Design a protein. Structure first.
Length: 164
């Protein structure tokens, strides 16, 4: 288990260690190294997802490790409350950024090992604090440089605690 301590409340998640082993290891290493301390949910789209783990306040992107393999061919679906890895168009490009699905986002799901099919790798699920996720997803947002859906007030991941 892992708890995001945000300035809107605690989000408790259970990792899917068997189904996305490299994603979960990559995630837990960032957690333990403090990488997510004082990052924000920088992209918030109600009825879609909330995305964070990349930027400090002022959209100062953090330096990351080399990207990880996409494990979305594990068959796990981007249903409400699941966590998945954000990434660019390249399927195996994900680094630290993740998002929480706030609806069932069936269109994000793996359908084939290809550009358009690879989809987004689910690696954990919220087990407590979906109320906090539902508060964050509804905050006011706006533009910030080349970025859209940036919360007008920072939604800050203050720190992460690991439970074993």
């Amino acid at each position: 288990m892992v708890t995001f301590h945000t300035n809107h409340g605690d989000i408790v998640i259970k990792t899917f260690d068997d189904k996305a082993p490299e994603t979960v290891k990559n995630f837990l290493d960032y957690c333990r190294e403090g990488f997510y301390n004082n990052t924000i949910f920088h992209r918030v789209i109600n009825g879609f997802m909330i995305q964070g783990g990349g930027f400090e306040p002022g959209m100062k992107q953090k330096a990351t490790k080399e990207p990880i393999k996409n494990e979305a061919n594990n068959g796990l679906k981007n249903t409400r409350g699941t966590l998945a890895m954000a990434r660019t168009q390249a399927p195996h490009s994900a680094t630290a950024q993740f998002f929480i699905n706030v609806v069932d986002n069936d269109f994000l799901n793996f359908s084939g090992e290809s550009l358009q099919g690879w989809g987004y790798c689910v690696f954990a699920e919220v087990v407590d604090g979906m109320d906090v996720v539902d508060k964050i997803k509804g905050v006011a947002t706006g533009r910030s440089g080349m970025h859209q859906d940036v919360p007008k007030e920072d939604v800050i991941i203050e720190s992460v605690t690991v439970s074993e």
